[PDB]
Design brief:
By secondary structure, the protein is an alpha+beta fold. It is about 20% helix and about 20% strand. It has one domain: Cathepsin B, Chain A (Alpha-Beta Complex), CATH 3.90.70. The chain contains 4 helices and 10 strands; from the N terminus they run βαααβββαββββββ. The radius of gyration is 16 Å and the shape is globular. The site of the ligand *[C@@H](C(=O)O)[C@H](O)C(=O)N[C@H](CCc1ccccc1)C(=O)NCCC(C)C has 17 residues, from helix 1 and strand 7. It comes from Trypanosoma cruzi.
Length: about 220
């Protein structure tokens, strides 16, 4: 609903996690999106497993990287729509390797039926996010190692390299901004979050936005 929406303030977002040394950003973005969409569909907020994707999704490349849209499709097409709880399939890729996939000994925490890819337009992405909840997006994270807090008003925007989760925006602030959940622990940014200026494709935020559909 226009002016400002922060889904963290509506019990919809889980705590900030840590990908460690694994290039598993794609999995953190995809699962963060699924956790928020599951809650918004009328289910308790449950922590879900990134490790399921890193180890079992063979259409992506584990710790070498992947794509959120491929991850969503693997869940539906190969894993019978199941997303395991984080407690039953804990993160094990912190050192930079993906252990072999185990197909049993886990509990289903959520299911999805598909995914939608959103327009490459920030006004349109805010409109969808405002009603339907957090969006999985890709950014150029090149300058993000120097981010110490505040609204980043200028961002290197050359090549997408990092998937993250858009959880809100605020258009009534002095400079309109987006609020993004990252996976580099609470010690980075504003307790694991970053705010970037909205309306000028900062960090190429509008280019690869999508969301899972639970129905
Ligand atoms: C992100 C990170 O851990 O910070 C990963 O390194 C990662 O997933 N990188 C991707 C590039 C390498 C790659 C692409 C496609 C298939 C295999 C490897 C990357 O661009 N991630 C962003 C994903 C968005 C664009 C969907």
């Amino acid at each position: 609903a226009p002016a400002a929406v922060d889904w963290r303030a509506r019990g919809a977002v889980t705590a900030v996690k840590d990908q460690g040394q694994c290039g598993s950003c794609w999995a953190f973005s995809a699962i963060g999106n699924v956790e928020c969409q599951w809650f918004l569909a009328g289910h308790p907020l449950t922590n879900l497993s990134e490790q399921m994707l890193v180890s079992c999704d063979k259409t992506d490349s584990g710790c070498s990287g992947g794509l959120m849209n491929n991850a969503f499709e693997w869940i539906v097409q190969e894993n019978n729509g199941a997303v395991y709880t984080e407690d039953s399939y804990p993160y094990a890729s912190g050192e930079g390797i993906s252990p072999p996939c185990t197909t049993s000994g886990h509990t289903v925490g959520a299911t999805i039926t598909g995914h939608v890819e959103l327009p490459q337009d920030e006004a349109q992405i805010a409109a969808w996010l405002a009603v339907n909840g957090p969006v999985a997006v890709a950014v150029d994270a090149s300058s993000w190692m120097t981010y110490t807090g505040g609204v980043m008003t200028s961002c290197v925007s050359e090549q997408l390299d990092h998937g993250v989760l858009l959880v809100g925006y605020n258009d009534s602030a002095a400079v309109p901004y987006w609020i993004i959940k990252n996976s580099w622990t609470t010690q980075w940014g504003e307790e694991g979050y970053i705010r970037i200026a909205k309306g000028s494709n900062q960090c190429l935020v509008k280019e690869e936005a999508s969301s899972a559909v639970v129905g």
